[PDB]
Structure formats: C-alpha cells, structure tokens
Amino acid sequence: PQDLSEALKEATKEVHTQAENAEFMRNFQKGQVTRDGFKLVMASLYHIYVALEEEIERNKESPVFAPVYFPEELHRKAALEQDLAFWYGPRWQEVIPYTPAMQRYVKRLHEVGRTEPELLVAHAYTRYLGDLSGGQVLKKIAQKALDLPSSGEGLAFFTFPNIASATKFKQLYRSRMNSLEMTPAVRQRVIEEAKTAFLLNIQLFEELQELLTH
Amino acid sequence: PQDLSEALKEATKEVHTQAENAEFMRNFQKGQVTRDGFKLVMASLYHIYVALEEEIERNKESPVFAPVYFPEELHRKAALEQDLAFWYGPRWQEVIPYTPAMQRYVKRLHEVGRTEPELLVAHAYTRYLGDLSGGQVLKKIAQKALDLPSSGEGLAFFTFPNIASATKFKQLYRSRMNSLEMTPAVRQRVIEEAKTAFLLNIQLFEELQELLTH
C-alpha cells in the first residue's frame, strides 16, 4: 500500500485481531463485562489519553504531527475526568489504579512524544480512530451489561461531541495522514510504532484480566 | 464588608433571591421541568460558558483575573458539548437555539472581556461558584424528573470532576478573589457587574418560561 493510512490498516491487521482475540476483550464483546472490569478499562484510558494528549500538545506545531492535529474533535481527557468522577467518586484521583501495564503504555507515549515525535501519529491513529470506530459497539454492550442507573454520566468517553459524522471525519483524518511527508525509513518506523501500540494494549488487557481473577 | 468575596455575596443577596423565584427556576425546584425546558437551559449554558470561557482565556495573563484562573477545576464548555450531543444529537451544534436572552448575556460577557476585563471576575464568580454550589441538588432533580435512558450521558455539566471538595475549592477561590488588587472605583463596578450578572440570568429565565408556555 502506497498511502500511509492504507499501509497502517494492512500492516496492523494481525495485531488488531490479536487485540480482538484477547480474553478480556473477547469477554467484553460477548457482553461478559463487570463493573470492576469496566472501571479498570476507564482508568486505563484516562492515563493513556492524559499522556498522549500531553505529547500531542507538545508537538502540535511540528510539521511531523501538525497535519493530524484535531484537539476539539478528538480530545478525550476531559470526558474521562467526568466519567471517572462517576465510577470512582469525587476522590477518584486519589483511588484510581495505575498499574505497571498502564505505566508501560504511558512511558512509551512520552518517549515517542519527546524523542521521536515523528512517531506520535502512530499512537494518535491507533487510539483515536480505534476508539472512534468501535466506539458505539462497545458502548451499547457496556450499558446493557453494566445495567447503569440514569444519572446521565459514566460514558461520555464514548461520545465525541465535536464530530458530526464519524465516517466523514474518519476520511478527513486519513487524508491528513497521507499528507504527512516522510522518509520511507520513518514511514516504516511509524508502521512499526503502530504495531507496538496494539501490543501495549494487548498486554494491558492481559494484565487487567489477571487482576480481576483472584 | 472589606473582603471582595463577602461584598459580592452580600450585594447580590436580593437579585439572587429574585433569581430563585423566577417562575422557571422556581418550578425546576419543585422537580417540574420537561426535556424541552431542560434542553433550553443546557443550550443557554453552552452559549454563556463558551463566551465566558473564551474571554477568560483572552485575559488569563492579566493581574485582574490570573489570581482566580482555575482552568482545569472549573471549565464547563467540554462538559456541555458532551451533554448537548446527547440531548440534540451529532448535529446539535447546527440546531441548538440561540435566543435574544441568550445573546444579551453572551454580549455583555464579550463586552467585559474586551473593554473592562477587570470585571470578568464578577461573571466567573457568579457562574462557577453558583453552578458548583447548586449543581448537585439540581442534578438529583433532573434525574428524577427527566427519566433518562441508562446510557450514561447528558448531565456531565452537573459534575466538576477536577474538584474533590466543593467546600475546600470555594475557600481557595474566595481567598484568590480577595488577593485581587483593584482601585475603589473598579471594586465598585465589580460589585455592580455581579448584580448585572444575576439579572442577565433572571432575564433568561423569564424568556425561557415564555417560550414554554406562550
């Protein structure tokens, strides 16, 4: 594939299925998800998005990332803050877990953002477009499996308010990715970094599943 | 009193009382409010907070507002975009109402922000401490009256996730308010703007009631 976006999709097809096959995620897909498991997933997201959005802000002007910079349409940090206040209560910042698997993911994000900005696009792609695509499917499953009350909160993360059409924004982002100018070498390190992104998610799923079976 | 915070709370005591008596807000207390009436309120808040917050960003560096600049703890724009996406849909931005009462409020905010930003503190105080202070009781009422689906969204506005204790934060804020430096003239106008702020709210409630009952 010549386009970076098409190259990413095909290069990450295997790990994507692997992330899909992970037990925690399999259980999820099969509506097998508990409150404790969901809390852990949300806590993970908060830490990952804080780190990712912190690095995007650091590189938003760089020509290696600027093209795919969409802060208003994609930022998730605030949505997660709102959500964790529901799941863990008002003192959530004090009690939310921060596991080694979460830290490994966060650590890589800062490294890329601070020493290999050119690769940041790989993580923003994996996270944003992934959470965007399978957003609804996972939300519907969760709300019907978590039997939530009606307090009007806890799932803001699954709704991107500043995006009218997912499909159409999905195409714009793909276009912007393809506009990125880079050496075939960098173009290859980015593809690699995308696979590393899934691997970091896969090991997170493995860890959370382990923490929940005691 | 000698303290700005004590002056504002005492100077706006009557306009506050009248604000709690405006028919619309009055019925909201009796747990009486429809989805349409609530949607109008949320729409109004989105507009007011967009204006207030963009003006707060303009003058955040100035000595007239910096002391009370608490972006993470208080921003509401994002929480309202999330809720409006739920109440109005993906195209909420293209269809929420923008009425005369909403506009007069927005107008004054930009006016103060552009010509007398030394008064913004009066608007930040009125809105933030006011919404934070009542946010919890209004939320339980909203829940009881609106019968929301169990989809975890639509009331994010009523929760300030980055504030563990409303009590402890209000203390620091009042403290930051009293550290504010200003001439007697300016201090008098700030006290006045706080009243103006309340009336802009009263004016909005009366307008909203007239749209719901004709």
Swiss-Prot record, chains A, B:
Q: Where does this one sit in the cell?
A: Endoplasmic reticulum membrane
* Linked pathology: Heme oxygenase 1 deficiency: A disease characterized by impaired stress hematopoiesis, resulting in marked erythrocyte fragmentation and intravascular hemolysis, coagulation abnormalities, endothelial damage, and iron deposition in renal and hepatic tissues. Clinical features include persistent hemolytic anemia, asplenia, nephritis, generalized erythematous rash, growth retardation and hepatomegaly.
Q: What induces it?
A: Heme oxygenase 1 activity is highly inducible by its substrate heme and by various non-heme substances such as heavy metals, bromobenzene, endotoxin, oxidizing agents and UVA.
Gene of this entry: HMOX1
Q: Does the keyword 4Fe-4S apply?
A: no
Tell me yes or no: is 4Fe-4S among this UniProt entry's keywords: no
Spell out the subunit comment.
Answer: (Microbial infection) Interacts with SARS-CoV-2 ORF3A protein; the interaction promotes ORF3A-induced autophagy but is unlikely to be involved in ORF3A-mediated induction of reticulophagy.
Query: Which residues of the complete protein does this chain represent?
Result: 10 to 223 of 288
State its Enzyme Commission number(s).
1.14.14.18
User: What family does this belong to?
Assistant: Belongs to the heme oxygenase family.
Please report the organism this UniProt entry assigns to the protein: Homo sapiens (Human)
Chain ranges sitting on the Cytoplasmic side read 1-214
Q: What tissues express this gene product? A: Expressed at higher levels in renal cancer tissue than in normal tissue (at protein level).
Q: What is known of its domains?
A: The transmembrane domain is necessary for its oligomerization.
- Please list the reactions this protein catalyses: heme b + 3 reduced [NADPH--hemoprotein reductase] + 3 O2 = biliverdin IXalpha + CO + Fe(2+) + 3 oxidized [NADPH--hemoprotein reductase] + 3 H2O + H(+)
Important for catalytic activity, annotated site positions: D131
GO MF term (any one): structural molecule activity
| Protein name in the entry | Heme oxygenase 1
